[PDB]
Amino acid sequence: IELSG
Amino acid sequence: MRVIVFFDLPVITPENRHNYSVFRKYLIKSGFIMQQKSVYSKLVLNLTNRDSIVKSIEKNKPPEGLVEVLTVTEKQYAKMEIIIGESKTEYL
Amino acid sequence: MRVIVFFDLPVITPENRHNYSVFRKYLIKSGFIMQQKSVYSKLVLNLTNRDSIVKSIEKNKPPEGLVEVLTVTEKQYAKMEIIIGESKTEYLNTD
């Protein structure tokens, strides 16, 4: 949901 | 740059096809334009906007399938080779 | 470089689906690797070969459909983002 990408 | 999103989603069951149309509608809502079936593109001015787009795609991804994101220059995109099965331009 | 072939071929009729498998087999025979059901790629070591590849695709094109051929660098190909479909309310593998 706190996307890391 | 241009961001290209190509996806390979199941279309067997009615739920699959519903889920396909939901993801397609999400891409259009995000300002992506169809290049061909299952292939959409959007101009991005900088990679910050690029990574925001990809993060949103991840948060809105379908329940099954493969979604891939390629980033190219506008010049590379403009030199794409276009091959049409029935090329000729005849009007009725 | 990498040559990426995106194709959008009809699958309506029995002839459509046969011609679809003919084009897919031609790509495989040509050394392209499947990335997705409609996306195939091939490593290109020298740019001379690139447009030889495009000429071959043109001569072996299916009778109907859209084929688009994009050339990208190996770095662009290697850093493609891969997103795997998962339901939002998915259970985690407790090993």
Author numbering:
A (entry chain Q): 3 to 7
B (entry chain B): 1 to 92
C (entry chain A): 1 to 95
Paper text:
Spacer acquisition step in CRISPR-Cas system involves the recognition and subsequent integration of protospacer by the Cas1-Cas2 complex in CRISPR-Cas systems. During the spacer acquisition step, the heterohexameric complex of four Cas1 and two Cas2 proteins preferentially insert a protospacer at the first CRISPR repeat region following the leader sequence. Here we report an anti-CRISPR protein, AcrVA5, and reveal the mechanisms by which it strongly inhibits protospacer integration. AcrVA5 exhibits low binding affinity towards Cas2 and acetylates Cas2 at Lys55 on the binding interface of the Cas2 and AcrVA5 N-terminal peptide complex to inhibit the Cas2-mediated endonuclease activity.
Hence, the Cas2-peptide (1MKIELSGGYICYSIE16) complex was chosen for structural determination. The initial model was further refined by Phenix/refine and rebuilt using Coot, with the final Rfactor and Rfree values of 19.51% and 23.21%, respectively. The complex structure contained one Cas2 dimmer and one AcrVA5 peptide per asymmetric unit, with crystallographic statistics listed in Table 1. The crystal structure of Cas2 reveals a compact dimer structure (protomer A & B) in which each chain is composed of three α-helices and five β-strands (α1: residues 14–29, α2: residues 47–59, α3: residues 74–78, β1: residues 1–8, β2: residues 33–36, β3: residues 39–44, β4: residues 66–73 and β5: residues 81–84). In our structure, the interaction between the AcrVA5-peptide and Cas2 is facilitated by a series of interactions: a hydrogen bond between Lys59 of Cas2 and Ile3 of AcrVA5, as well as non-bond contacts between Lys55 of Cas2 and Leu5 of AcrVA5, Gln58 of Cas2 and Leu5 of AcrVA5, and Lys59 of Cas2 and Ile3 of AcrVA5. The buried surface area of the complex of Cas2 and the AcrVA5 peptide is 434.56 Å2 per molecule, thereby suggesting that this complex could be physiologically relevant. Structure superimposition between two protomers of Cas2 reveals a high similarity in the overall structure with a ferredoxin-like fold with an r.m.s.d of 2.03 Å (overall 88 residues), except for the significant structural conformation variation in the C-terminus. The structural heterogeneity observed in the C-terminus was most likely caused by the interaction between Cas2 and the peptide of AcrVA5. Although the β6–β7 region in the structure of Cas2 is unresolved, the binding of AcrVA5 in the α2 helix of Cas2 causes steric hindrance with the neighboring protospacer. Consistent with the MS results, the K55A mutant rendered Cas2 insensitive to inhibition by AcrVA5 in degradation dsDNA substrates, which shows that Lys55 is a structural determinant dictating Cas2 inhibition by AcrVA5.
